[PDB]
């Protein structure tokens, strides 16, 4: 019953579209985005990547049982971490540059220590608490890890304890994506029900619900100001939502694209976002002018993941051909 | 770039590439099998006779050929989002229990049709199995079979009934020029079940190899 009142408030609080305000602003024209390097080490299709905190390193995890650490400037491979389960669908890089966590169909997402007196990567804490595959397990601190599963539950953990201190519930379907706010105080996630719920870490329960899609969602990211986020699903519809207004702002779609999305990201100032489609191409879109800024070729099969460093120098895209291209 | 640091860096990168290449070569001389079916269709007995916390793994050895069987029934999730990991598998082993026609087998039919005509599994040949033929015999000589499906009228002979089950299972695949299906009857105690899989895999390899030469 309250849903009708909430919808009435939603339609009352919205009066203008961002197109009206941007109509007085000229677009930034065409930018030439050219590849600089190409990374060639993977045999099977790759599934994830995570940019470092110093804009120089990244990791990628593939189905051949290996996840690998590169140096982005000289394209030198530095670490090869053999796995236990050949099914790996997610990866993460610790903000302090110490840990990497990955996990797939077996109901776990392990923990690896990079900087070791041993001198080699080992597994530290095997986090086993779900009844489904894990789609994304990111990092909050050097000691708190947040996991999102196909078990229709997002689980906040604590590595040293070994047991989850808090559990999150509220999705009928299974969640496949999870993103963190810059202040490490809130985080959001979305599931196959085409809904995204703002999760709080202090008290451990959701606050608000974000809807508008009609299919399963693939990736999300916050706006860098710590107030908004943009989402991607298989309906070729990137949607934009903000924490404060709790509304729909801009629909990012086009009539000549019919395939889905796989990952999204924002530029340093949020002027433009990325989207690596199923037609093995990326697409830079003006985040305000809502027009296609350019198209990037370079792969053959399908984009799997992409991201931008902290400083904005680089952007790296991955695909099922097992090739990573560094762009500039 | 003419410093020991970056020379050592490129040396380490080259050796990491070489190690990865060797491993990728090693893990390709191996035949991967997706063992799929309903929960209580007799999978476990298949596991034991073939051998002689989510996805479960299995290993073999039989006359210089290596198999690999996965079990994807333990976990319940959105099947549409983890099936593409299984591309390049040689064959799919579908296990069905015969006794359960009157207890369900209709659901098995719906599952078979969904798994065979997958867009991602267009060109993979299917091995079939049929288990618990004994209790099928007792059930059919105690009770009729038309209650399962009245559209069929015929004798209560075990041969005719088993042939009808085989034909009903086999007529589901829509595409036949590239994909072919093998059936087999099992009585839960056989010494001739690994041989059937060996022969099916060998036939699959030969019929694929003749294709690129232009023959077949």
């Amino acid at each position, epitope marked *: 019953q309250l849903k009708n009142q909430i919808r009435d408030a939603r339609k009352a609080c919205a009066d203008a579209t961002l197109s009206q305000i941007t109509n007085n602003i000229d677009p930034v024209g065409r930018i030439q985005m050219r590849t600089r390097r190409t990374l060639r080490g993977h045999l099977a299709k790759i599934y994830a990547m995570h940019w470092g905190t110093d804009s120089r*390193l990244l990791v990628s995890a593939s189905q051949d049982g290996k996840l690998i650490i590169w140096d982005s400037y000289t394209t030198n491979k530095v670490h090869a971490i053999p796995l236990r389960s050949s099914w790996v669908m997610t990866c993460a890089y610790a903000p302090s540059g110490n840990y990497v966590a990955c996990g797939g169909l077996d109901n776990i997402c392990s923990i690896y220590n990079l900087k070791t007196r041993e001198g080699n990567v080992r597994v530290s804490r095997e986090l086993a608490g779900h009844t489904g595959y894990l789609s994304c397990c990111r990092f909050l601190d050097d000691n708190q890890i947040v996991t999102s599963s196909g078990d229709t539950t997002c689980a906040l953990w604590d590595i040293e304890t070994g047991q989850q201190t808090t559990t999150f519930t509220g999705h009928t379907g299974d969640v496949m994506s999870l993103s963190l706010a810059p202040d490490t105080r809130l985080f959001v996630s979305g599931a196959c029900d085409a809904s995204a719920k703002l999760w709080d870490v202090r008290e451990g329960m959701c606050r608000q619900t974000f809807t508008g899609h009609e299919s399963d969602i693939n990736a999300i990211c916050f706006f860098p100001n710590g107030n908004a986020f943009a989402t991607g699903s298989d309906d070729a519809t990137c949607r934009l939502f903000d924490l404060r207004a709790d509304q729909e702002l801009m629909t990012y779609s086009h009539d000549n694209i019919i395939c889905g999305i796989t990952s999204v990201s924002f530029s340093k100032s949020g002027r433009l976002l990325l989207a690596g489609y199923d037609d093995f191409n990326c697409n830079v879109w003006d985040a305000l002018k809502a027009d296609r800024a350019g198209v990037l070729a370079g792969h053959d099969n399908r984009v799997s993941c992409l991201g931008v460093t902290d400083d904005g120098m680089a952007v790296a895209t991955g695909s099922w051909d097992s090739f990573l291209k560094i762009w500039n | 770039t003419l410093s*020991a640091e970056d020379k050592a860096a490129v040396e*380490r990168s080259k050796m990491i590439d070489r190690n990865l290449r060797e491993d990728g070569e090693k893990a390709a001389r191996e035949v991967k099998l997706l063992l799929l079916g309903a929960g209580e269709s007799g999978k476990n007995t298949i596991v034991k006779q073939m051998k002689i916390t989510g996805i479960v793994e299995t290993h073999f050895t039989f006359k210089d050929l290596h198999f690999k069987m996965f079990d994807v029934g333990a976990q319940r999730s959105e099947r549409k989002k983890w099936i593409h990991c299984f591309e390049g598998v040689t064959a799919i082993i579908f296990c069905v229990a015969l006794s359960d026609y009157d207890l369900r087998m209709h659901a098995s039919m719906k599952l078979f049709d969904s798994i065979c005509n997958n867009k991602w599994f267009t060109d993979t040949s299917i091995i079939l199995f049929l288990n618990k033929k004994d209790l099928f015999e007792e059930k059919i000589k105690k009770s009729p079979l038309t209650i399962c499906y009245p559209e069929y009228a015929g004798s209560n002979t075990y041969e005719e009934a088993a042939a009808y089950i085989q034909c009903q299972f086999e007529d589901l695949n829509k595409r036949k020029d590239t994909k072919e299906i093998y059936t087999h009857f099992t009585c839960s105690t056989d010494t001739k079940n690994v041989q059937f899989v060996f022969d099916a895999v060998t036939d699959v390899i030969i019929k694929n190899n003749l294709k690129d030469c232009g023959l077949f």
Partner: single-chain antibody
């Protein structure tokens, strides 16, 4: 983790001796290997280097060919083939480990050492210290050490009297792990100094300033600090 070495002793001139450094608690197959010798009264002097799997092996001018090197991944046993020794070859041969990539910490963990019997110069040989004060040591290089990648191939090493040395500051601007988190350094091309802030007990030792820009791996003349 522990590194232990053997093969020391006394050999008559013109003889041959085999030198080894056993490995335990780590993967030798994923680490480089280096050898640095120090005279009983002088500073360090680098010997050779082995990449992973002996892909590359260099030597200094004075040790090119007459001291060959090898490694053993499966058995984790190190080999040093030596022949025709002279009086100037006696020194403390230090089993030094390292790794090379971004974020590296070369020369981080050192063995005990073996007893077998670009020009870089340091400003002052010996400087007295007093507790609670601040003292700095400067280091000068003949040529600018800044390379095209911006990485200053400068290291400072400290050896406690009678013990194996440690890594303190690498790249002249980054602080090693396990240090008391007090030392710091700064400077510009060929102009560098080591600043000790709030010096404390057990800081008595010798500081070493070595280059890595080119590849002769030459060290400084030594810097002594005494209470």
């Amino acid at each position: 983790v522990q590194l232990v070495e053997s093969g020391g002793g006394l050999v008559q001139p013109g003889g041959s001796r085999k030198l080894s450094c056993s490995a335990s608690g780590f993967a030798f197959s994923s680490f480089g290997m280096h050898w640095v010798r120090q005279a009983p009264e002088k500073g360090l002097e680098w010997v050779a280097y082995i990449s992973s799997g002996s892909g590359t092996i260099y030597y200094a001018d004075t040790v090119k060919g007459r001291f060959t090197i090898s490694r053993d991944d499966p058995k984790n046993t190190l080999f040093l083939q030596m022949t025709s020794l002279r009086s100037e070859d006696t020194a403390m041969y230090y089993c030094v480990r390292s790794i090379y990539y971004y974020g590296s910490s070369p020369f981080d963990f050192w063995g005990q050492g073996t007893t077998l019997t670009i020009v870089m110069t340091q400003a002052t040989s010996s400087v007295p210290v007093t507790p609670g004060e601040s003292v700095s040591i400067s280091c000068r290089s003949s040529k600018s050490l800044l390379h095209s990648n911006g990485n200053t191939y400068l290291y400072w090493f400290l050896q406690r009297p009678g013990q194996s040395p440690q890594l303190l500051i690498y790249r002249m601007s980054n602080l090693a792990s396990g240090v008391p988190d007090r030392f710091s350094g700064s400077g510009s091309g060929t102009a560098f100094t080591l600043t000790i802030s709030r010096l404390e007990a057990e800081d008595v030792g010798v500081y070493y300033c070595m280059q890595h820009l080119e590849y002769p791996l030459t060290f400084g003349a030594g810097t002594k600090l005494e209470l």
